[PDB]
Amino acid sequence: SGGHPLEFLRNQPQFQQMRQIIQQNPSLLPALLQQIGRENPQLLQQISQHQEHFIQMLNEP
Amino acid sequence: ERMQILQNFKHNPKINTIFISKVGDTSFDLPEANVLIQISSHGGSRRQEAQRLGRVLRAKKGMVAEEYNAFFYSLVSQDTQEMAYSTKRQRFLVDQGYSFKVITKLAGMEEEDLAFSTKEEQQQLLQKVLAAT
Amino acid sequence: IETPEQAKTRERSEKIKLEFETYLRRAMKRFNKGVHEDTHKVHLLCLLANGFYRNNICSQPDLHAIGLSIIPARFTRVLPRDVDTYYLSNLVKWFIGTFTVNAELSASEQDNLQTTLERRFAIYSARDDEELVHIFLLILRALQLLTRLVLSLQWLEVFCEQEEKWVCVDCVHGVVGQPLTCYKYATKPMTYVVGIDSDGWVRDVTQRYDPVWMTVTRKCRVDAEWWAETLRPYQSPFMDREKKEDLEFQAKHMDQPLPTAIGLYKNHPLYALKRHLLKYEAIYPETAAILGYCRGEAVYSRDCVHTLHSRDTWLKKARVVRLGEVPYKMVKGFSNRARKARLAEPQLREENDLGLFGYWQTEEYQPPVAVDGKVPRNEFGNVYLFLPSMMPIGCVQLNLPNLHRVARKLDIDCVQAITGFDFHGGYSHPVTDGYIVCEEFKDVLLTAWENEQAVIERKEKEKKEKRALGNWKLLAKGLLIRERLKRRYG
């Protein structure tokens, strides 16, 4: 059990949709880019570390 | 802040009344003045307050011809021991020929309104003083 | 002309407000630019995850079996060790003649990539050029060829053991061993080029295919540290392969473009122009006479360019200049007193020329050893303690507040522990962290500090109790006097 700050983010519903988008179709990339740039200081900070957990989150089927 | 107050006295004409404790003897520099009012003294330091008078009052242009161009007042409470101090002290200044004319009453105090006109204020002042033993 | 002091105060208020708002503006610009850069990095991470997903889909065994069945026996019997340029060209030509470009085929987002590729195999058709690249990758993986799918943010890299080289292959355009041609047929904006192995191992191959990597893209790509951290987990276990690829890249890029533009020689260690150095960095003519020229500008090796620091800064770096060392660079000296003096008269601003020294010119600082219970002190009457090694032997640092009061009370030699420098208003005040004392009295000083802490605690207790008692006494005497005077007049 690799307790990471992205554990809430991994199961975060909007972030769940974002990881689903990243997993298969990058077409909706601009929507995620706009969301993160407009308001995601927390995502900006937390995405720096624990990249493997972030990638595995993006790989959730 | 000490030098701030000193410069305010030196430069600001609105404020020309500075109250100084015993530190005015030698602890700092006294700007040249013309009216020196001494209320309380050490209690017989005939040289200390005479030196304070000498340092406070300096040569000023404009009234050099007149024999009275600097004004010094020494407030002494009647029938107190303070009188015994003053005569003890100004003795040194008597050695230099300086004279002190006794002014029992001040002309003009009646018309101008001053503090403690009522004794009821004065008894409150007495309360305050006796509070500090 | 009216109240000049008010005007001066107004000017000072405007100045301070302007400084505040300008530094706030700069901070805000830094914040939003960093947000943009981080969003760009997250977009790059999304692209990397997309490449991972594509490679994982291309790693399916069903696609391998389909490719093996479709591939004729002529291409099947050729092992990866025997694969050469002619075989690659023949296979690419067969692929072109096998699968064509037909975007008219029905496409649905519901259909999976694997299912779509299997259907295209069934009909021997395709939908897009990237689909052709994926189909060629599947065909190569059918023969278990050591191949990596390379994407531009596309082609394949085949690790030929005859040359031990990652040869570039592009099926749609019939490109074999033409990396520069890959620059044309890939994505036009080429800032990142990533090669993912069938197992998911990621390699940077932007340098090979982008001719402008070593000049512009070197200074115009993403941060090296963040990207290195990103690629660290997926570093390929083939360490020997990585070393060989690095050596090949070095051989290819060793002064290959031969630029001769003055701007290019700036901030480029491979060239290290004398005029393109810094105030502290300086060339070494002993090991660098001439290596090239650009518009009358000589070239010297970067290894002959060395950084320098002041003797005080070297001591801060725990380094002591050797006796008789010559100043490697005599440069502008600036310290509080020195800065004010130089502002007083500019003739000595150039004439100061503090003489820095090289690292090779300075030895490691050797802290002394306390003798006879005496703590050594510098000219400033202290010890510089930028690093723990700087402490003299036989000394102990104690970070106990107000401990020196007890030390002098107990007549114990105690000094401050100079840590660094702080400057609130423009002056580098030394910064100390605790007191350096002799090791012999360390625990005695601790005991004294404990005793004095307890004593000051109880002293504060009795002081506040006596304050309350004095307040009681003052109130009682005040009421007594009030009653007495009221009785005197009522």
Side-chain angles (χ1 to χ4, degrees):
Chain A
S1 302
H4 292 12
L6 292 84
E7 189 176 4
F8 170 80
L9 300 180
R10 173 183 59 91
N11 308 327
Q12 204 278 342
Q14 298 185 8
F15 218 172
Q16 283 173 329
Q17 176 56 226
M18 298 156 189
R19 80 192 178 174
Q20 177 65 22
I21 291 171
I22 300 172
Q23 181 181 182
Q24 43 178 167
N25 284 87
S27 305
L28 299 188
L29 161 141
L32 171 58
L33 265 54
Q34 173 183 3
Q35 167 60 30
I36 183 183
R38 292 308 172 89
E39 39 184 352
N40 261 124
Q42 309 172 2
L43 179 53
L44 261 59
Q45 179 178 358
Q46 297 301 328
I47 203 173
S48 56
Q49 34 71 29
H50 299 350
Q51 302 79 7
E52 305 179 11
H53 179 256
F54 177 75
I55 298 173
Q56 290 186 1
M57 169 199 173
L58 302 189
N59 304 140
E60 300 287 348
Chain B
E1 187 179 1
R2 171 201 294 178
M3 293 190 174
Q4 158 66 207
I5 298 175
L6 291 183
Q7 298 318 119
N8 292 321
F9 181 82
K10 294 169 192 176
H11 299 351
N12 173 31
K14 292 185 175 183
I15 298 178
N16 268 330
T17 304
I18 40 178
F19 284 71
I20 302 180
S21 71
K22 187 186 177 184
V23 298
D25 305 357
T26 40
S27 186
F28 65 93
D29 157 62
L30 299 163
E32 308 177 6
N34 301 131
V35 171
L36 173 63
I37 301 177
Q38 170 182 160
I39 295 184
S40 177
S41 58
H42 176 89
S45 68
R46 39 98 81 86
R47 76 129 195 92
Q48 195 74 284
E49 315 308 81
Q51 156 268 171
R52 115 195 299 189
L53 159 68
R55 199 173 192 264
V56 161
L57 297 186
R58 287 292 309 111
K60 183 179 183 178
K61 52 187 177 181
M63 296 171 57
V64 188
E66 182 178 346
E67 200 193 2
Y68 292 143
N69 44 28
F71 302 83
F72 172 82
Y73 299 78
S74 178
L75 298 179
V76 189
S77 298
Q78 309 167 13
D79 297 328
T80 61
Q81 70 170 351
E82 188 178 15
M83 311 269 299
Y85 287 154
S86 61
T87 308
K88 176 182 179 180
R89 162 178 293 104
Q90 65 218 36
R91 248 296 184 177
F92 172 74
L93 296 174
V94 175
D95 300 322
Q96 311 316 116
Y98 291 80
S99 301
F100 305 88
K101 44 178 54 184
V102 175
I103 310 179
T104 64
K105 40 197 173 183
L106 301 175
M109 295 186 65
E110 315 84 347
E111 292 75 9
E112 300 290 75
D113 185 12
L114 300 180
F116 305 99
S117 182
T118 166
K119 66 176 58 179
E120 190 169 351
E121 235 277 22
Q122 301 187 347
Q123 61 196 9
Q124 300 152 358
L125 174 62
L126 176 59
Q127 278 284 336
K128 298 183 185 300
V129 174
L130 290 182
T133 303
Chain C
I1 81 284
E2 181 64 27
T3 318
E5 307 182 10
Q6 175 187 4
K8 295 179 181 179
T9 303
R10 162 186 172 181
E11 293 179 6
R12 296 161 189 171
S13 61
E14 289 190 12
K15 172 195 64 61
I16 192 69
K17 182 182 53 56
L18 179 60
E19 185 178 10
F20 214 132
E21 68 192 22
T22 45
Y23 110 83
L24 250 54
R25 213 73 64 260
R26 310 313 305 121
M28 175 268 184
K29 291 303 172 295
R30 300 153 194 170
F31 171 80
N32 51 67
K33 192 174 183 180
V35 169
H36 155 55
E37 181 175 1
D38 204 333
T39 307
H40 167 274
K41 290 186 178 181
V42 175
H43 145 86
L44 177 58
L45 292 183
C46 299
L47 299 184
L48 178 60
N50 174 265
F52 272 119
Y53 175 80
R54 261 72 175 275
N55 187 83
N56 298 331
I57 296 302
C58 293
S59 300
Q60 292 295 336
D62 300 331
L63 308 168
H64 308 158
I66 293 178
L68 177 59
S69 56
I70 289 189
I71 285 175
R74 51 176 177 176
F75 299 104
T76 306
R77 53 189 176 183
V78 176
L79 295 184
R81 53 183 178 182
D82 300 334
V83 167
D84 60 324
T85 302
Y86 184 55
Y87 175 80
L88 290 178
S89 178
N90 300 333
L91 188 52
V92 170
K93 292 175 183 178
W94 174 84
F95 188 89
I96 294 181
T98 309
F99 317 91
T100 63
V101 181
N102 180 24
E104 302 178 358
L105 295 180
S106 60
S108 178
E109 299 175 355
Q110 180 71 13
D111 310 331
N112 296 330
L113 179 59
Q114 176 185 1
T115 62
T116 306
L117 293 177
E118 293 177 3
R119 295 155 197 178
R120 299 321 175 197
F121 274 120
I123 324 177
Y124 281 89
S125 303
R127 182 175 55 191
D128 55 82
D129 60 331
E130 293 185 353
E131 191 145 355
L132 283 171
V133 175
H134 293 181
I135 294 180
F136 193 81
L137 172 61
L138 300 183
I139 277 181
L140 296 204
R141 296 189 189 192
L143 300 181
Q144 302 178 9
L145 309 177
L146 179 52
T147 59
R148 302 189 178 184
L149 175 62
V150 188
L151 304 86
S152 174
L153 319 166
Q154 305 182 15
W155 60 87
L156 281 73
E157 281 183 347
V158 184
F159 185 82
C160 298
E161 301 188 7
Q162 304 180 11
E163 311 165 1
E164 294 184 340
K165 168 65 180 181
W166 286 103
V167 189
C168 57
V169 181
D170 186 12
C171 61
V172 189
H173 314 86
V175 175
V176 180
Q178 306 176 1
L180 304 183
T181 304
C182 300
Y183 186 90
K184 182 177 183 178
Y185 291 139
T187 312
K188 311 172 184 178
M190 197 157 305
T191 51
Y192 343 102
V193 178
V194 284
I196 291 186
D197 192 8
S198 57
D199 303 323
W201 309 121
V202 182
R203 190 60 178 182
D204 194 326
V205 289
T206 306
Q207 37 191 327
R208 181 194 295 107
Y209 299 81
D210 185 15
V212 213
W213 154 256
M214 287 298 177
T215 60
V216 178
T217 320
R218 161 176 158 265
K219 298 180 178 179
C220 297
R221 210 179 183 176
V222 85
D223 167 67
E225 298 183 0
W226 175 86
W227 189 237
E229 173 185 354
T230 302
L231 299 194
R232 186 176 182 179
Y234 287 100
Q235 288 178 3
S236 178
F238 302 98
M239 310 308 177
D240 298 327
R241 186 189 308 183
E242 298 184 355
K243 298 175 181 181
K244 296 170 185 177
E245 187 178 351
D246 202 328
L247 295 176
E248 293 165 4
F249 284 159
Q250 167 189 1
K252 176 181 180 178
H253 294 267
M254 177 52 185
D255 291 358
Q256 188 71 17
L258 219 173
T260 329
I262 294 182
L264 297 184
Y265 285 75
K266 188 175 181 179
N267 307 333
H268 206 120
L270 298 182
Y271 313 130
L273 225 299
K274 45 174 177 56
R275 62 171 291 180
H276 298 338
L277 301 187
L278 288 180
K279 171 182 182 178
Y280 305 99
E281 297 190 16
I283 28 74
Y284 217 174
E286 300 177 357
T287 148
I290 270 179
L291 300 177
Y293 256 84
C294 161
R295 223 290 176 265
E297 298 180 1
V299 173
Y300 312 96
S301 179
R302 174 61 224 190
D303 310 330
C304 318
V305 194
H306 326 271
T307 68
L308 310 171
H309 286 61
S310 71
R311 179 169 304 178
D312 312 8
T313 320
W314 286 131
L315 177 54
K316 169 257 177 181
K317 218 173 184 179
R319 307 211 55 80
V320 176
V321 190
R322 301 168 177 175
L323 306 178
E325 287 284 356
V326 297
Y328 201 93
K329 265 296 180 59
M330 305 60 60
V331 298
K332 183 101 88 296
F334 255 70
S335 67
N336 308 317
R337 152 239 52 188
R339 179 170 64 260
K340 248 49 188 177
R342 269 53 184 180
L343 263 62
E345 191 172 355
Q347 70 92 4
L348 52 149
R349 170 172 290 101
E350 170 266 1
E351 204 253 8
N352 49 21
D353 293 328
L354 165 62
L356 316 181
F357 302 98
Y359 156 75
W360 65 102
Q361 310 173 211
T362 70
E363 301 176 1
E364 175 180 343
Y365 161 74
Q366 300 181 4
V369 182
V371 182
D372 315 329
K374 308 171 183 178
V375 179
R377 296 182 184 180
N378 54 12
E379 181 180 358
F380 196 71
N382 201 277
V383 169
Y384 303 103
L385 202 48
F386 302 88
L387 292 180
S389 59
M390 309 184 63
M391 175 179 297
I393 315 180
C395 307
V396 169
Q397 184 278 337
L398 297 186
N399 194 16
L400 304 185
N402 292 315
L403 182 61
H404 178 96
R405 153 248 180 176
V406 183
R408 184 176 180 178
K409 174 185 177 180
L410 296 195
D411 317 4
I412 305 180
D413 184 15
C414 133
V415 203
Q416 320 163 359
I418 283 183
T419 297
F421 295 94
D422 181 13
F423 15 88
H424 303 251
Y427 306 92
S428 52
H429 314 148
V431 177
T432 68
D433 178 19
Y435 316 107
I436 308 173
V437 218
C438 302
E439 188 177 18
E440 42 184 0
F441 305 109
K442 176 189 179 182
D443 300 334
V444 183
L445 197 47
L446 299 176
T447 305
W449 198 62
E450 301 335 274
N451 303 139
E452 263 44 47
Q453 249 67 206
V455 166
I456 196 179
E457 289 157 6
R458 45 128 282 96
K459 283 183 61 59
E460 164 271 352
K461 300 162 199 172
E462 58 83 14
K463 277 181 179 180
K464 60 178 173 54
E465 268 65 286
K466 291 179 181 179
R467 292 161 200 172
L469 297 179
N471 305 143
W472 278 117
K473 178 179 182 180
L474 176 59
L475 291 174
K477 295 188 87 290
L479 230 185
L480 286 178
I481 300 163
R482 212 136 191 173
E483 179 185 359
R484 177 181 301 178
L485 283 199
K486 286 183 179 180
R487 182 181 180 181
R488 200 49 52 190
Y489 292 88

